[PDB]
Amino acid sequence: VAPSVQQKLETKVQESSDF
Amino acid sequence: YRCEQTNSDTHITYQKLDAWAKFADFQTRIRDAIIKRQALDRIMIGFNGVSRAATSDRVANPMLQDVNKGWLQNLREQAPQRVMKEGKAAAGKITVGGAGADYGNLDALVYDITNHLVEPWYAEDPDLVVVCGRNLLSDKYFPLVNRDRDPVQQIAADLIISQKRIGNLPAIRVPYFPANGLLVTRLDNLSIYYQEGGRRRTILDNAKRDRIENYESSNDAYVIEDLACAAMAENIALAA
Amino acid sequence: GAGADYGNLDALVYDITNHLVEPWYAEDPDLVVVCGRNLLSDKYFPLVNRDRDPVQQIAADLIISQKRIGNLPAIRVPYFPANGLLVTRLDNLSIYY
Amino acid sequence: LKSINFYGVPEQEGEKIGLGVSGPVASTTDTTQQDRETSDISTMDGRR
C-alpha cells in the first residue's frame, strides 16, 4: 500500500542544569 | 527548615514499552532522561516553590509553585526587606528608566541592591553573583544594540555582551527562574538540605495497573545559608 | 528607520538568537548566522554612509573586517532569500540523498 | 555546500523522533487521605 516509514530515535536534550 | 517530603514519581505503561519495543534501549533512555529531568526539576522548585501544599495540582501550578519553599520564598518569608517587592514610588512593581526615572537601566537596579540590601561585608565580596533567567539578561543586553550605536560603541557593546556581568557582578544563567525577578547572592550561600536516609527509592512492577512504576520520595529543603548576602527584586517591569 | 523595532539588524539577530534559538544552544560558538551577501552589504552600508568622525571610520573598517553579525559569525551564501536571515550551526543542515 | 551534511539514507521517507518529557515530574502529596498518583510525562514527536 504505502512504504513503511523507517524511524530512528533522537533523545530530546533537556535544558542544561549545571547550576 | 523542615526537610519535608517530595514525591517524585514516574510510571511507564506497558503499552508504551511494548509499542516501542523495536528500540532495544528505549526503556533505559527514558530513565536517563527522567533522571536529568528530575535534577532540573529540583532546581526549578528551588526558585518557583512558593509553598508546600498537601496536594500538588499539575494544572494550577505547572511551575511547581506548591511543592516546597524555594530559596526565593525563604527571602519572601524571612527577612522580607531583602525582597525589593516594589520600586521607588511605582505602582506595585519596579519600573525602569522608560517610565520617567526609577533605577534607570538594570545595572543601576542591581547596583542599588548590591549596596543597599546585601550586607556591607558581602557587598564587596568578589564571589557575589547575580542569578537571572533568560528574559531579563538577554533583554538587558538588547538595548545595547537596539539603539543604533556607532562603530566604537558597537565594538564595546559586543564586548559587554561577551561579558555576562550584570552591573558589576557575574551573571548566572538559570532555567525556570521567575521572570521579572533577580537574585543577588553567593552560589555558596545556597544549599539543598536533603535528609540522609531520605532516599525512599523503589522500583515497582505494578502489573495490577500494567505499568512499570518508580517512586522516589526525597526529603529536601531549599535553604539560604545566610540572609546577609541574599537580596532580590521582584516585578522588574523592563519597559521596551 | 522608524520608531524602535529591532533597531539595526544586529539587534534583530540578537533577539532571534536569545528568544527563538534554544536557550542552551544560544551560545554554541559555531552558531553562525546564514544570510545573503546582499543583506550584510545593506547593514554594513550605514557604517560608511552617515559621515562619521575619522576615529569612528577606523572602527567601522574594523567591524566590516569582522563578518560577525549581531555577535555571531555571518555566512555569506548565494541565492538566499531577500529580506531573510537564518541562524543555525551549519551541522543542523543536512541533505539526505 | 562543503559544510552541509550529506547522508546516504537507504529509503525515500522516514522520521527521526525526539524523546522529550512533558515538563515537571517531581511533586508532593500527603498520603494521609490520597495516593502518590504517578503521572507519565514522557512525550515523543518526530520529524519526517
Residue numbers in the entry:
A (entry chain B): 31 to 49
B (entry chain B): 98 to 337
C (entry chain C): 195 to 291
D (entry chain C): 50 to 97
The authors write:
The ϕRSA1 capsid is composed solely of the polymerization of the major capsid protein, gp8, which exhibits the typical “Johnson” fold first characterized in E. coli bacteriophage HK97. As opposed to the latter, the ϕRSA1 mature capsid is not stabilized by covalent crosslinking between its subunits, nor by the addition of a decoration protein. Phage’s capsids are primarily composed of the major capsid protein (MCP), which assembles as hexamers and pentamers called the capsomers that ultimately form a closed icosahedral shell with the portal/connector complex located at one of the capsid’s vertices.
We solved the three-dimensional structure of the ϕRSA1 mature capsid to 3.9 Å resolution by cryo-electron microscopy. The capsid follows an icosahedral symmetry characterized by a triangulation number T = 7, dextro (d) in which the 11 out of the 12 vertices are made of pentamers (the last one is the portal connected to the tail) while the flatter facets are made of hexamers. The core of the subunit is composed of the Axial (A) and Peripheral (P) domains to which the more flexible N-terminal (N) domain and Extended (E) loop are attached. In total, each MCP interacts with eight others: two are from the same capsomer, while the other six are spread across three different adjacent capsomers. The analysis of the various subunit–subunit interactions reveals that there are five main interfaces which can explain all the intra and inter capsomer’s interactions. The G-loop of ϕRSA1, which is longer than in most phages, acts as a sort of lock for the E-loop.
